[PDB]
Amino acid sequence: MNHPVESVYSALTSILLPYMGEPVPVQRNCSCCGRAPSEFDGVGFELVNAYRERVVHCRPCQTFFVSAPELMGVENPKKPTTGQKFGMWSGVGAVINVEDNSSVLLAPQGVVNKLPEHFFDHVEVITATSGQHLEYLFNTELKFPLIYIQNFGVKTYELVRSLRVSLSADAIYTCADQLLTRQNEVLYMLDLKKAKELHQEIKNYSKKEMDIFIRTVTLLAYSRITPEAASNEFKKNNLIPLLLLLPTDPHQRLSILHLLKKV
Amino acid sequence: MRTLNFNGKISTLEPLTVTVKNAVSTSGHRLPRNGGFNAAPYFPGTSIRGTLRHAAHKVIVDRVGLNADGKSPFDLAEHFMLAQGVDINGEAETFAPGEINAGAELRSKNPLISLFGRWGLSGKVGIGNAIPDGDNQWGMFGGGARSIMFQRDESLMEFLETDQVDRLERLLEEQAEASVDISQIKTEQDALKKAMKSADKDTKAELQIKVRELDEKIQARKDQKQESRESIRRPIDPYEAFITGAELSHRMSIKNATDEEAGLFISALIRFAAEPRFGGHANHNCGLVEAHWTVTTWKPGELVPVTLGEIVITPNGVEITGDELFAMVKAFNENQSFDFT
Amino acid sequence: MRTLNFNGKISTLEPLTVTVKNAVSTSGHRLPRNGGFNAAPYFPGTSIRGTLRHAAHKVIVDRVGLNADGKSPFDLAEHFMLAQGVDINGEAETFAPGEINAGAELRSKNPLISLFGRWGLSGKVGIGNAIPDGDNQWGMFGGGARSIMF
Amino acid sequence: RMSIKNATDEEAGLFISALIRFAAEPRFGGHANHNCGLVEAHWTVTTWKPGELVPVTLGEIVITPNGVEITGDELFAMVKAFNENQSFDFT
Amino acid sequence: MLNFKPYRVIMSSLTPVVISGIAPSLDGILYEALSQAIPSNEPGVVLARLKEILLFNDELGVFHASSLRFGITPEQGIGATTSMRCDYLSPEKLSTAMFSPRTRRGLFTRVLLTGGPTKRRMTTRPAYSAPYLTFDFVGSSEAVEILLNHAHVGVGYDYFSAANGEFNNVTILPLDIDTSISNEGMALRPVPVNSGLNGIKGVSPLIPPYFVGEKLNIVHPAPVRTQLISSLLRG
DNA sequence: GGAGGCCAAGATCTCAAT
Ligand SMILES: [Zn+2]
């Protein structure tokens, strides 16, 4: 119910509800999401993965493992009858508007080509590679709260446990197939508001000065130049006002720079 | 129930090296560093922990022995539980997250899992890094250069027949031609790279596109080669390592060590001494070390260390000093309740 | 199945030199150093390993036999595999990771490739560097000058 | 220092035979035009059974310009095991 | 319960530090050190002893022990590194001398290493590399010196297994003002939200061990804070 | 005849360098 996967299901992956089949009464947790059975109403899907494991899935988690070739195309011609799955879509992202219950797929050109005509009536698809996600997030007037899936990936279980709802532009949680522990949550948070502020204030400086700033912050973040040398460079090119906008965290600095260089 | 702190040194009889993904750049191979290229390196405690966990696993395998048919009594699931700590079939006990002192029965029956934990059970053995003492105790060892065995020793040509000599000549010619062609492609790629920074934002894409296409042209050129896909003559890249005779400070601990778990750890260190090497590049006999640890504990009721003994590992043997350590080893050897399955 | 450790010394009868690509500079020819520019030199374990590997290769070549013409049964590929440890035809029995007892049969049948190994097969032999015992046991040799003989 | 990890009798015998053949031309390195590289070496062979506290010396290999000296019955046993095993396929 | 004076501890960082969302606090390190010294894991006992060497603020329910603050020199500043942990399945581990694999046609079924339950785990975490690590506290300098020097504790996450946050050269120098909880109205450690202190909001326990107990709404400083080592030594 | 096991296939691309 009140789980991030339900929001993804309703907004995006309820399209293949007709092909799911009927559930079975189950007595164990959903290994995919781990939530208690009390939010399943006792029904779930029994599945065997290629590793020969008996995993129980709720309805929202099952949509990542459902093959509907007539709806989602086919990903590998060697296996004609197995369609593209949300649980196997490497390189495909999605921005999900929870309140409006609408979703926006960010698929690359190859995946878009593989998609049949019937797909586009149900899901709005944007042609954008993995590197072009940042452009879409930057330019689009985002509606919050939203779930932004950066990469559906192949490791569904870790994607499902890592789904988080972004309440504001301060903290957009980029969700991928990598497990979101508290030790690596700095890599999967994007300070869009501060990046946009820095981009707005980066326009006052020259292109050469901007490149110097980006290279100096990147080298300093990787312990490649001494702080004294970086400070001398910043003073020389008058980049001190820019430096005060960056977070002290080097990983946040690198995320913000990666966003600036893409937009 | 006491904490056993192992403080000591590790002296490298041979260069000591380790390959870590984030420390090995494309510019060269480097040891792990806590900072830039001017920082002093260290030998990861993860590598030492893995080596000692394998030694403890070998101790357990030797102790348990082999079945009547001669096959090891551990299946794949138990093997990965003892070795990597993962449970592959989902049959492991899942303790409640609230408590800390969990798995008391499992810790009592399986000393290896108690020392080195599994997923869901914290391990009592902490193994720290090997921090160097000096300031110039690392250097770029290895290196060398692969040669052609027939261009170096002419007596080897007498063994080859005429067809094989012709094949060798074709191989050398192909190697030279491919070297020249690939050098030209790399030159063009580098020319693209130099103007890449000066390139405009729109041009940032297709320059990378041509670099990519140049890369697969190199791959296709090497695929066109028939006698050999790889040039036999090539410079070998050196690896960074700690020099011979480097002194590295090492700290190890066992938290709440029973006599049996500490005995298993001492036995692992004893068995580790038969082949006492960390790290890789064993082809150059790298990694061989000698270490001496001062086993100490905490005085009950106050913050005062108490020395229990000392473990010295040398090429000439293992010296265990201290009656307490022998008591731990004997307690491990005499226990008849352990079940590692 | 035992571990044998060869601990000993190498005594020098004639000057011992080696040209390592990363050790020599434009300033001059230098021996590889035991870490740093001012440390004691050493003789690389790579050179000793290569010399002993080729010696073992010739042991194998002599043991297999030479025909009346003095030719060995091994083609070019076998010679390269046994001495250089490189395969040219691409027929080396690549062991996918996860194989249980990966080199068992190859090691049992080919003691040379078991000792010294190849890519994908760890060699059992590790031959370390040679470290001098004292100081100032190295110096600049060679020298001289070519001259018009007339 | 040299070592063979988990060496059978046959592989140790091959290594010892390599050392014996190396003694005929005990040359390391380059600049052989000045006869650089001649060496004489002696190695003490020891084995260490895991689980025990001390190693045991098997013998000694001495390479000198006057000959090759190998001591200890274990090294001779290794060489004989290599020279008398006919199940080796090197191709 | 003793004559507790405010101290600042500065240690040299030897290994990159992995921060579990909330910056490590010195009371956590001292709790681990005392859990090793006292051969007991009971939180009640360790906390009862920890209060003898760290001042406990009853009003807020937190120890006078500041969180981590990286000390940067002009030679080296706060850097970005990853903590790499991998499964090394050596030929010894994949051998029949250790386990008996399942057999088909006499051949041994290979371990599927690219994925599954038996995959090589390439677990990587963000880490921070700075020359110095600095904590502020009010307590017995002798006991904290002994615990930091002799116990098996690091600064950060999972020092026991990975040896992240290894440190040495622990230097303790007395302070003039207690800067362990508050400084100019900004919280320097996880404090209750009702304390009136400013900082990043979050959910965490107030006393160690921080992985055990009900998680209240707290206010904590930024996880990665840096201060110049010259300004730290000023005292 | 599942049932074990292998092997090939699936999107596009990652700048830090004494
Ligand atoms: Zn679920």
PDB file of C-alpha atoms in Angstrom, chain B residues 1-3 5-7 19-22 33-36 39-42 44-47 49-50 54 57-58 61 66-67 70-77 79-80 83-89 97-101 119 123-131 249 251-256 298-305, chain E residues 13-17 31-41 43 49 53 76 81-90 92-101 103 111 113 117-119 121-122 128-131 142-144 146-154 159-164 166-168 209 211-213:
ATOM      1  CA  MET B   1      35.120 -13.713  27.471  1.00  0.00           C
ATOM      2  CA  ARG B   2      37.852 -11.146  26.927  1.00  0.00           C
ATOM      3  CA  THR B   3      39.282  -8.988  24.166  1.00  0.00           C
ATOM      4  CA  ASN B   5      44.457  -7.226  20.945  1.00  0.00           C
ATOM      5  CA  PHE B   6      47.238  -8.208  18.539  1.00  0.00           C
ATOM      6  CA  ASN B   7      49.693  -5.333  18.125  1.00  0.00           C
ATOM      7  CA  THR B  19      45.518  -4.544  -6.987  1.00  0.00           C
ATOM      8  CA  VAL B  20      42.497  -2.423  -6.055  1.00  0.00           C
ATOM      9  CA  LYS B  21      40.070  -1.242  -8.717  1.00  0.00           C
ATOM     10  CA  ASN B  22      39.856   2.401  -7.677  1.00  0.00           C
ATOM     11  CA  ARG B  33      46.302   5.756  -0.949  1.00  0.00           C
ATOM     12  CA  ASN B  34      44.423   7.889   1.569  1.00  0.00           C
ATOM     13  CA  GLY B  35      44.611  10.900  -0.693  1.00  0.00           C
ATOM     14  CA  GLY B  36      46.698  12.018  -3.642  1.00  0.00           C
ATOM     15  CA  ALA B  39      50.197  10.390   0.359  1.00  0.00           C
ATOM     16  CA  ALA B  40      51.741   7.333   1.896  1.00  0.00           C
ATOM     17  CA  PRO B  41      50.145   4.076   0.716  1.00  0.00           C
ATOM     18  CA  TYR B  42      48.830   1.246   2.860  1.00  0.00           C
ATOM     19  CA  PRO B  44      44.374  -2.986   2.892  1.00  0.00           C
ATOM     20  CA  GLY B  45      43.109  -4.760   5.957  1.00  0.00           C
ATOM     21  CA  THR B  46      40.514  -6.379   3.723  1.00  0.00           C
ATOM     22  CA  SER B  47      43.222  -8.378   1.947  1.00  0.00           C
ATOM     23  CA  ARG B  49      41.306 -10.380   6.538  1.00  0.00           C
ATOM     24  CA  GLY B  50      40.573 -12.456   3.456  1.00  0.00           C
ATOM     25  CA  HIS B  54      40.947 -18.548   4.136  1.00  0.00           C
ATOM     26  CA  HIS B  57      38.699 -22.140   6.647  1.00  0.00           C
ATOM     27  CA  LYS B  58      41.609 -24.425   5.774  1.00  0.00           C
ATOM     28  CA  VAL B  61      38.651 -28.309   6.623  1.00  0.00           C
ATOM     29  CA  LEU B  66      37.254 -36.119   4.734  1.00  0.00           C
ATOM     30  CA  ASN B  67      34.384 -38.565   4.511  1.00  0.00           C
ATOM     31  CA  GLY B  70      37.356 -39.198   0.535  1.00  0.00           C
ATOM     32  CA  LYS B  71      35.041 -36.363  -0.498  1.00  0.00           C
ATOM     33  CA  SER B  72      34.858 -33.273   1.669  1.00  0.00           C
ATOM     34  CA  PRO B  73      31.802 -33.261   3.973  1.00  0.00           C
ATOM     35  CA  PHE B  74      30.958 -29.657   3.007  1.00  0.00           C
ATOM     36  CA  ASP B  75      28.601 -28.957   0.132  1.00  0.00           C
ATOM     37  CA  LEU B  76      28.479 -25.698  -1.833  1.00  0.00           C
ATOM     38  CA  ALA B  77      26.172 -23.948   0.642  1.00  0.00           C
ATOM     39  CA  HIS B  79      31.437 -23.863   1.674  1.00  0.00           C
ATOM     40  CA  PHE B  80      30.144 -20.392   0.863  1.00  0.00           C
ATOM     41  CA  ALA B  83      34.324 -18.855   2.960  1.00  0.00           C
ATOM     42  CA  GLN B  84      32.331 -15.801   1.843  1.00  0.00           C
ATOM     43  CA  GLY B  85      29.698 -15.621   4.571  1.00  0.00           C
ATOM     44  CA  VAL B  86      26.757 -15.632   2.152  1.00  0.00           C
ATOM     45  CA  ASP B  87      23.793 -17.976   2.461  1.00  0.00           C
ATOM     46  CA  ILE B  88      22.942 -19.170  -1.031  1.00  0.00           C
ATOM     47  CA  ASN B  89      19.875 -21.314  -0.263  1.00  0.00           C
ATOM     48  CA  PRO B  97      17.411  -7.003  14.317  1.00  0.00           C
ATOM     49  CA  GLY B  98      16.746  -5.602  17.789  1.00  0.00           C
ATOM     50  CA  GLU B  99      19.208  -7.646  19.812  1.00  0.00           C
ATOM     51  CA  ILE B 100      23.000  -7.501  19.591  1.00  0.00           C
ATOM     52  CA  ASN B 101      24.047 -10.665  21.457  1.00  0.00           C
ATOM     53  CA  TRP B 119      25.530 -11.888   6.753  1.00  0.00           C
ATOM     54  CA  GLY B 123      32.281 -11.172  13.444  1.00  0.00           C
ATOM     55  CA  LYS B 124      34.534 -10.927  16.466  1.00  0.00           C
ATOM     56  CA  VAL B 125      37.766 -10.646  14.456  1.00  0.00           C
ATOM     57  CA  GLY B 126      38.897  -7.190  13.466  1.00  0.00           C
ATOM     58  CA  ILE B 127      41.939  -7.008  11.202  1.00  0.00           C
ATOM     59  CA  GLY B 128      43.443  -3.601  10.519  1.00  0.00           C
ATOM     60  CA  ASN B 129      45.562  -2.190   7.746  1.00  0.00           C
ATOM     61  CA  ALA B 130      49.316  -2.640   7.440  1.00  0.00           C
ATOM     62  CA  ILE B 131      50.504   0.973   7.695  1.00  0.00           C
ATOM     63  CA  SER B 249      52.446  -1.655  11.620  1.00  0.00           C
ATOM     64  CA  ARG B 251      46.725  -4.158  14.573  1.00  0.00           C
ATOM     65  CA  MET B 252      44.326  -7.078  15.043  1.00  0.00           C
ATOM     66  CA  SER B 253      41.689  -7.803  17.663  1.00  0.00           C
ATOM     67  CA  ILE B 254      39.152 -10.387  18.776  1.00  0.00           C
ATOM     68  CA  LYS B 255      36.126  -8.950  20.575  1.00  0.00           C
ATOM     69  CA  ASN B 256      34.736 -11.120  23.394  1.00  0.00           C
ATOM     70  CA  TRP B 298      42.373  -5.578  29.046  1.00  0.00           C
ATOM     71  CA  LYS B 299      42.760  -5.856  32.800  1.00  0.00           C
ATOM     72  CA  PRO B 300      39.310  -6.671  34.227  1.00  0.00           C
ATOM     73  CA  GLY B 301      37.592  -3.675  35.763  1.00  0.00           C
ATOM     74  CA  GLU B 302      40.049  -1.009  34.609  1.00  0.00           C
ATOM     75  CA  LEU B 303      41.547   0.484  31.456  1.00  0.00           C
ATOM     76  CA  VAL B 304      44.993  -1.086  31.746  1.00  0.00           C
ATOM     77  CA  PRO B 305      46.440  -3.397  29.065  1.00  0.00           C
TER      78      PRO B 305
ATOM     79  CA  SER E  13      43.666   9.569   9.092  1.00  0.00           C
ATOM     80  CA  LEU E  14      45.308   6.579   7.419  1.00  0.00           C
ATOM     81  CA  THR E  15      42.371   5.096   5.484  1.00  0.00           C
ATOM     82  CA  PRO E  16      39.329   6.607   3.744  1.00  0.00           C
ATOM     83  CA  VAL E  17      36.322   7.135   6.003  1.00  0.00           C
ATOM     84  CA  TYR E  31      31.205   3.058  23.217  1.00  0.00           C
ATOM     85  CA  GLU E  32      32.844   0.523  20.911  1.00  0.00           C
ATOM     86  CA  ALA E  33      36.157   0.882  22.736  1.00  0.00           C
ATOM     87  CA  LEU E  34      34.435   0.267  26.064  1.00  0.00           C
ATOM     88  CA  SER E  35      32.457  -2.647  24.647  1.00  0.00           C
ATOM     89  CA  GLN E  36      35.845  -4.157  23.857  1.00  0.00           C
ATOM     90  CA  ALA E  37      37.455  -3.169  27.174  1.00  0.00           C
ATOM     91  CA  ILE E  38      34.502  -4.289  29.244  1.00  0.00           C
ATOM     92  CA  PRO E  39      33.975  -7.811  27.981  1.00  0.00           C
ATOM     93  CA  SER E  40      30.266  -7.027  27.652  1.00  0.00           C
ATOM     94  CA  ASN E  41      27.889  -6.083  24.845  1.00  0.00           C
ATOM     95  CA  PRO E  43      24.184  -1.381  26.250  1.00  0.00           C
ATOM     96  CA  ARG E  49      30.761   2.908  32.286  1.00  0.00           C
ATOM     97  CA  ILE E  53      34.590   9.064  31.093  1.00  0.00           C
ATOM     98  CA  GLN E  76      45.800  17.882   1.188  1.00  0.00           C
ATOM     99  CA  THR E  81      37.381   7.790  -2.716  1.00  0.00           C
ATOM    100  CA  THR E  82      35.508   4.496  -2.827  1.00  0.00           C
ATOM    101  CA  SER E  83      35.655   1.610  -0.359  1.00  0.00           C
ATOM    102  CA  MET E  84      36.112  -1.525  -2.461  1.00  0.00           C
ATOM    103  CA  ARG E  85      35.126  -4.944  -1.119  1.00  0.00           C
ATOM    104  CA  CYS E  86      35.118  -7.985  -3.382  1.00  0.00           C
ATOM    105  CA  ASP E  87      34.838 -11.759  -3.295  1.00  0.00           C
ATOM    106  CA  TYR E  88      38.125 -13.387  -4.261  1.00  0.00           C
ATOM    107  CA  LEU E  89      37.242 -16.954  -5.220  1.00  0.00           C
ATOM    108  CA  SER E  90      40.722 -18.394  -5.564  1.00  0.00           C
ATOM    109  CA  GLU E  92      41.847 -23.031  -3.510  1.00  0.00           C
ATOM    110  CA  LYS E  93      38.274 -21.985  -2.724  1.00  0.00           C
ATOM    111  CA  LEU E  94      37.017 -23.536  -5.973  1.00  0.00           C
ATOM    112  CA  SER E  95      38.604 -26.899  -5.242  1.00  0.00           C
ATOM    113  CA  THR E  96      37.379 -30.337  -4.248  1.00  0.00           C
ATOM    114  CA  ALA E  97      39.757 -30.359  -1.277  1.00  0.00           C
ATOM    115  CA  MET E  98      37.406 -27.873   0.433  1.00  0.00           C
ATOM    116  CA  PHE E  99      33.952 -29.013  -0.680  1.00  0.00           C
ATOM    117  CA  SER E 100      32.329 -31.702  -2.778  1.00  0.00           C
ATOM    118  CA  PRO E 101      30.624 -30.130  -5.807  1.00  0.00           C
ATOM    119  CA  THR E 103      28.577 -33.864 -10.344  1.00  0.00           C
ATOM    120  CA  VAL E 111      30.029 -21.960  -9.597  1.00  0.00           C
ATOM    121  CA  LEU E 113      29.984 -16.223 -10.651  1.00  0.00           C
ATOM    122  CA  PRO E 117      23.365 -16.398  -4.954  1.00  0.00           C
ATOM    123  CA  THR E 118      27.029 -17.198  -5.661  1.00  0.00           C
ATOM    124  CA  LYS E 119      28.196 -14.076  -7.483  1.00  0.00           C
ATOM    125  CA  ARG E 121      30.094  -9.253  -4.907  1.00  0.00           C
ATOM    126  CA  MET E 122      31.679  -5.999  -6.079  1.00  0.00           C
ATOM    127  CA  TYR E 128      36.290  10.490   2.207  1.00  0.00           C
ATOM    128  CA  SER E 129      40.044  10.976   2.525  1.00  0.00           C
ATOM    129  CA  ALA E 130      41.375  13.889   4.574  1.00  0.00           C
ATOM    130  CA  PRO E 131      44.673  14.313   6.436  1.00  0.00           C
ATOM    131  CA  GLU E 142      43.535   9.813  30.098  1.00  0.00           C
ATOM    132  CA  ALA E 143      40.739   7.295  29.573  1.00  0.00           C
ATOM    133  CA  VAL E 144      39.965   8.580  26.081  1.00  0.00           C
ATOM    134  CA  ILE E 146      43.947   4.907  26.320  1.00  0.00           C
ATOM    135  CA  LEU E 147      40.778   3.798  24.556  1.00  0.00           C
ATOM    136  CA  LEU E 148      41.636   5.486  21.267  1.00  0.00           C
ATOM    137  CA  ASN E 149      45.228   4.247  21.269  1.00  0.00           C
ATOM    138  CA  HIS E 150      44.671   0.646  22.351  1.00  0.00           C
ATOM    139  CA  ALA E 151      41.141  -0.402  21.419  1.00  0.00           C
ATOM    140  CA  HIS E 152      40.172  -1.625  17.958  1.00  0.00           C
ATOM    141  CA  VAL E 153      38.145   1.395  16.901  1.00  0.00           C
ATOM    142  CA  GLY E 154      38.174   3.516  13.771  1.00  0.00           C
ATOM    143  CA  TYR E 159      36.284  -0.512  10.794  1.00  0.00           C
ATOM    144  CA  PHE E 160      36.154  -4.003  12.267  1.00  0.00           C
ATOM    145  CA  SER E 161      35.838  -5.747   8.917  1.00  0.00           C
ATOM    146  CA  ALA E 162      37.047  -3.334   6.234  1.00  0.00           C
ATOM    147  CA  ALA E 163      39.438  -1.311   8.435  1.00  0.00           C
ATOM    148  CA  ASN E 164      37.970   1.921   7.101  1.00  0.00           C
ATOM    149  CA  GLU E 166      42.138   3.700  10.502  1.00  0.00           C
ATOM    150  CA  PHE E 167      43.859   6.444  12.478  1.00  0.00           C
ATOM    151  CA  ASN E 168      46.975   6.984  14.570  1.00  0.00           C
ATOM    152  CA  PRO E 209      25.043   2.129  19.809  1.00  0.00           C
ATOM    153  CA  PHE E 211      21.993   1.037  15.296  1.00  0.00           C
ATOM    154  CA  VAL E 212      19.977  -0.038  18.368  1.00  0.00           C
ATOM    155  CA  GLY E 213      16.927   1.638  19.863  1.00  0.00           C
TER     156      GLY E 213
END
